Ligand binder design. Structure first.
Ligand SMILES: CC(=O)N[C@@H]1[C@@H](O)[C@H](O[C@@H]2O[C@H](CO)[C@@H](O)[C@H](O)[C@H]2NC(C)=O)[C@@H](CO)O[C@H]1O
Ligand SMILES: CC(=O)N[C@@H]1[C@@H](O)[C@H](O[C@@H]2O[C@H](CO)[C@@H](O)[C@H](O)[C@H]2NC(C)=O)[C@@H](CO)O[C@H]1O
Ligand SMILES: CC(=O)N[C@@H]1[C@@H](O)[C@H](O[C@H]2O[C@H](CO)[C@@H](O)[C@H](O)[C@H]2NC(C)=O)[C@@H](CO)O[C@H]1O
Ligand SMILES: CC(=O)N[C@@H]1[C@@H](O)[C@H](O[C@H]2O[C@H](CO)[C@@H](O)[C@H](O)[C@H]2NC(C)=O)[C@@H](CO)O[C@H]1O
Ligand code: NAG
Ligand code: NAG
Ligand code: CA
Ligand code: CA
Ligand code: CA
Ligand code: CA
Ligand code: MN
Ligand code: MN
Ligand code: MN
Ligand code: MN
Lengths: 236, 236, 236, 236
């Protein structure tokens, strides 16, 4: 079998194999709310990571791991629009929420620069793209591949369906250094896709930590960032 | 673990766990050529299926299986255009090539009707769409979900890259009856996607056979239909 | 993931991915009776194999596969003693029941010789050891590793529990060429174990077929040979 | 797939997904030495656990997980005899080495009582059985199932082979509450086995931590406690 493999059909409150950072928590209905869901609605940032670090590449052998993750999430806005987005990410083992972060940086970045020191690769599901506060984002809700910077290296228009459940399948094929995000809404057949080339060895350290993150930088334009299920498998 | 799961990193000549029908064969370089690759180029039809049938649904319990398959293929044309296409499919256990078939029907259909008797669900990678011989096809190279008929129930434009390797990931989520085709070319980031609702129970019998098929209805506009690797997992 | 992997929690009547030979069949309660269970009791021989052949070793690369199988069975005798036994085995792809076989040879051997041509490796659960008809067997009910001959190369006393369910775990570690049979009765903690060195490459052809077999050479001393569940995984 | 599954073909020095307690460490040759290997030989105690906790049972649903673990170890003594032993165990999530422990208690127990508070289930590979310091142990080197107490609830004679590699397969079948230890030495076919009934729900809390432990209570009778590989899979 492969190096690592784990499935979560549902989450349980205060799960021991998940590290909660920020407002991230799991409701009694079994859903992981990376973003605080409360009345009244409050400004929030949260991240949830699998407790054990993953060896993503080996310095001794030069081998890079190929992984695949599948998960289902929901983003429900009270209004027609919402903020700020959700993100699946790989960061250095036991990464802490960068000091002075913000909802628009999904708790992954301290600023809008492209510093190789960040050592972060993430797939963002950006719901907010306004240029007043997010000048880097394009003119629409998007799915983006982020490498060491919140300014995605490649994006694609996200046909977001308010309150609808999305099935995401992300694959990473080490041999060809390609990353493929595969999103689809089973309710109405709406689906989006994006692929990009990335060399993990050249960006992340050997041992990383995987998980999700998100934010809400304005309680006025509230929306949830609930992940329902999560499958992950990696292999060197 | 799941009911069934098999991986083929490469194929071997005259593989014992694969049923070859038509011109389907595997070259000494380890690639499954569902379509005959010869000099001079000849009209051809072929299908390759995994030897053991799969229980796709249970009449006793009403449960429907959820499956996922991943594979990589190449379609190389001598000219700029080619024929006829490739297809991944589920057919009744040990299905034979329908009598009087043709390249445009990928060896899966006897005619252009929508007969529930065909009991075939397939994902086509149609390279030929000319209305003179394929009146059902749209005005472009496409990826299509076929249900009991060669006239796809839903299609999407296929941004085919001649000679380039494509990575396909198809998923079937029984609970939501949705099928998602996820194609991408690692070489240039080009990717396509399609989702559709289908109830396997309502179309195929309990025991099916899975595999690939394709054809070339005109030696003049030759192209290969080579599948390089195949991963398959099913579960009730 | 690995080359092959399949799980059967229960069997269904006339399962399509299992090849039935002899009196082998599956009752409506979901159990695979390799031996005929009828009133009145009749002399019988049966074998059940997984439909697809398995590549156990590669001539091109010299690599040998490591496999592991787990299953649960029951052997119920009307009297205190019973015949003839059960066997898990690896034989050439799509092997037929040897002409002129007998219950004591579990439908795997034509005679009592050690012919390398048999190309059979099997784990027997011998219930009958009488020297009048089975001169090769030791003085007790045994578990035996059979290589090209019904005269086991190594045996161990089997503490058979009439009607009780046995959990067997067999492992094959290619690197060290060792085979380990691990049997245990959850009801009363009774357990037996045996290990032996065997080189698959030196005995079986590249493509084999796996399954079970058994017999009853005397309806007077009847017993069942029912296998309840089966897990199998192989990898090159 | 199952809830959790991880394979370690070899260990790397200062592995990030393993928690080292005591003298436990991993040499540059890639082997996990739970016991300190130094010149001169020194008194030692160590434990290594997988970083993420495992949900072994669910209070919400009453379901108990079934697990299986496979590993290979070596115990090499300079003399003909050695101390003290090795142990595979399940303890409360992130358990610390009990205060005032000793080599004979493999770093799992504070005393020789049977306190349900210990919440520990372990499989011991006891090399030392002298009654002067280990009055609970039987008159031979043994494999034992320990439940909340170092006084095994069931043991079996261990035919230890000095310096030889042992392949262990432990299985836990929740439905029948049975635990089966399956040990074998591929070098000379020597093998041992033990089964016992245990209800995890009645002993451990929902979230446990798994790993190995061992000790050496006398530098004079030194031996290694090296684990070479580890496979683990659990499922609710
Ligand atoms: C050069 C030429 O015009 N060749 C003709 C073929 O195109 C034509 O057959 C059809 O080829 C199509 C494209 O490959 C297929 O979609 C179609 O299935 C196939 N038709 C059949 C019956 O095989 C044939 C037949 O009219 O004539 C050739 O001359
Ligand atoms: C050579 C000698 O007699 N050394 C003594 C130790 O044997 C003895 O300690 C005990 O060693 C046993 C065997 O390794 C262990 O089972 C036992 O746990 C351990 N006892 C403790 C408290 O560590 C020690 C202690 O009496 O004295 C040494 O002199
Ligand atoms: C109603 C309103 O204008 N609220 C302001 C809020 O938008 C604004 O900034 C934040 O909100 C956007 C969208 O959610 C995020 O992309 C930004 O990250 C976030 N900025 C920061 C620093 O959190 C704040 C701050 O200017 O002011 C609110 O009044
Ligand atoms: C009651 C009795 O003596 N029946 C005889 C039967 O035992 C005997 O042989 C067979 O039975 C043994 C035990 O089941 C098997 O191990 C042998 O394989 C099997 N022999 C053959 C050729 O099937 C038969 C044949 O001598 O005679 C019965 O009368
Ligand atoms: C179409 O295929 C089916 C199955 O082989 C066959 O019964 C039918 O007659 C075929 N049509 C023609 C025209 O042969
Ligand atoms: C035994 O271990 C427990 C847990 O560390 C501790 O509370 C207890 O006091 C220990 N016994 C002694 C004598 O220290
Ligand atoms: Ca944004
Ligand atoms: Ca066409
Ligand atoms: Ca016999
Ligand atoms: Ca001891
Ligand atoms: Mn963005
Ligand atoms: Mn078409
Ligand atoms: Mn025998
Ligand atoms: Mn002991």
């Amino acid at each position: 079998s492969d190096d690592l493999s784990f499935n979560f059909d549902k989450f349980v409150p205060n799960q021991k194999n998940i590290i909660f950072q920020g407002d991230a928590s799991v409701s009694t209905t079994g859903v992981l709310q990376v973003t605080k869901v409360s009345k009244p609605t409050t400004t929030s940032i949260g991240r949830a990571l699998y407790a054990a670090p993953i060896q993503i590449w080996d310095s001794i052998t030069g081998k890079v791991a190929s992984f695949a993750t599948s998960f289902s999430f929901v983003v429900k806005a009270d209004k027609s629009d919402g903020v700020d987005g959700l993100a699946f990410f790989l960061a250095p083992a036991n990464s802490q929420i960068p000091s002075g972060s913000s909802a628009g940086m999904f708790g992954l970045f301290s600023s809008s620069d492209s510093k190789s020191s960040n050592q972060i690769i993430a797939v963002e599901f950006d719901t907010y793209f306004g240029k007043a506060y997010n000048p880097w984002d394009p003119d629409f809700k998007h799915i983006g591949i982020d490498v060491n910077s919140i300014k995605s290296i490649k994006t694609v228009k996200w046909d977001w369906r308010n309150g609808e459940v999305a099935d995401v399948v992300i694959t990473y094929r080490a041999p060809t250094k390609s990353l493929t995000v595969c999103l689809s809404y089973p309710s109405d057949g709406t689906s989006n896709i994006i692929t990009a080339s990335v060399d993990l060895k050249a960006i992340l350290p050997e041992w990383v930590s995987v998980g999700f993150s998100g934010g809400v930088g304005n309680a006025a334009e509230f929306e949830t960032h609930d992940v329902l299920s999560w499958y992950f498998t990696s292999n060197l």
